[PDB]
Amino acid sequence: FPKFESKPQSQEVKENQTVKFRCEVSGIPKPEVAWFLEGTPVRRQEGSIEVYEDAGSHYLCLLKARTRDSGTYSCTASNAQGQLSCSWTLQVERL
């Protein structure tokens, strides 16, 4: 069943900085991790947004954080037996 072993925490940061969110999911078969911003999926870009798995940890990274990225973020681990979801916030500052 999908469980969260380590949830991403909220972070307030300056503009254009790198942000990293780390979901860590356990479960049988393999919880498919999906990320969202206020209910909208957060999909990867060429070199702006990236979503990947590395050493059992799922990641979301904004390498150049803009003010449009502020808001409530969510992560959903999902397999054939269920769906487990959690949330946190991002605050991108200006000058």
Curated annotation (Swiss-Prot):
Tissue specificity of this protein: Smooth muscle and non-muscle isozymes are expressed in a wide variety of adult and fetal tissues and in cultured endothelium with qualitative expression appearing to be neither tissue- nor development-specific. Non-muscle isoform 2 is the dominant splice variant expressed in various tissues. Telokin has been found in a wide variety of adult and fetal tissues. Accumulates in well differentiated enterocytes of the intestinal epithelium in response to tumor necrosis factor (TNF).
Disulfide bridge partners, by residue number: 23-75
Positions of the Ig-like C2-type domain: 2-91
Subcellular location field: Cytoplasm; Cell projection, Lamellipodium; Cleavage furrow; Cytoplasm, Cytoskeleton, Stress fiber
Residues modified as Phosphotyrosine: 52, 59
Inducers of expression: Accumulates in individuals with asthma (at protein levels). Induced by tumor necrosis factor (TNF). Repressed by androgens (e.g. R1881).
Transmembrane segments: none
Free-text description of this protein's post-translational modifications in UniProt: Can probably be down-regulated by phosphorylation. Tyrosine phosphorylation by ABL1 increases kinase activity, reverses MLCK-mediated inhibition of Arp2/3-mediated actin polymerization, and enhances CTTN-binding. Phosphorylation by SRC at Tyr-52 and Tyr-59 promotes CTTN binding.
Function: Calcium/calmodulin-dependent myosin light chain kinase implicated in smooth muscle contraction via phosphorylation of myosin light chains (MLC). Also regulates actin-myosin interaction through a non-kinase activity. Phosphorylates PTK2B/PYK2 and myosin light-chains. Involved in the inflammatory response (e.g. apoptosis, vascular permeability, leukocyte diapedesis), cell motility and morphology, airway hyperreactivity and other activities relevant to asthma. Required for tonic airway smooth muscle contraction that is necessary for physiological and asthmatic airway resistance.
Family to which this protein belongs: Belongs to the protein kinase superfamily. CAMK Ser/Thr protein kinase family.
Recorded disease: Aortic aneurysm, familial thoracic 7: A disease characterized by permanent dilation of the thoracic aorta usually due to degenerative changes in the aortic wall. It is primarily associated with a characteristic histologic appearance known as 'medial necrosis' or 'Erdheim cystic medial necrosis' in which there is degeneration and fragmentation of elastic fibers, loss of smooth muscle cells, and an accumulation of basophilic ground substance.
Assembly behavior: All isoforms including Telokin bind calmodulin. Interacts with SVIL. Interacts with CTTN; this interaction is reduced during thrombin-induced endothelial cell (EC) contraction but is promoted by the barrier-protective agonist sphingosine 1-phosphate (S1P) within lamellipodia. A complex made of ABL1, CTTN and MYLK regulates cortical actin-based cytoskeletal rearrangement critical to sphingosine 1-phosphate (S1P)-mediated endothelial cell (EC) barrier enhancement. Binds to NAA10/ARD1 and PTK2B/PYK2.
Additional facts recorded: In asthmatic patients, overexpression promotes actin filament propulsion, thus contributing to airway hyperresponsiveness. Some MYLK variants may contribute to acute lung injury (ALI) susceptibility. Potential therapeutic target in the treatment of burn edema.
Record-given protein name: Myosin light chain kinase, smooth muscle
Native source organism of the sequence: Homo sapiens (Human)
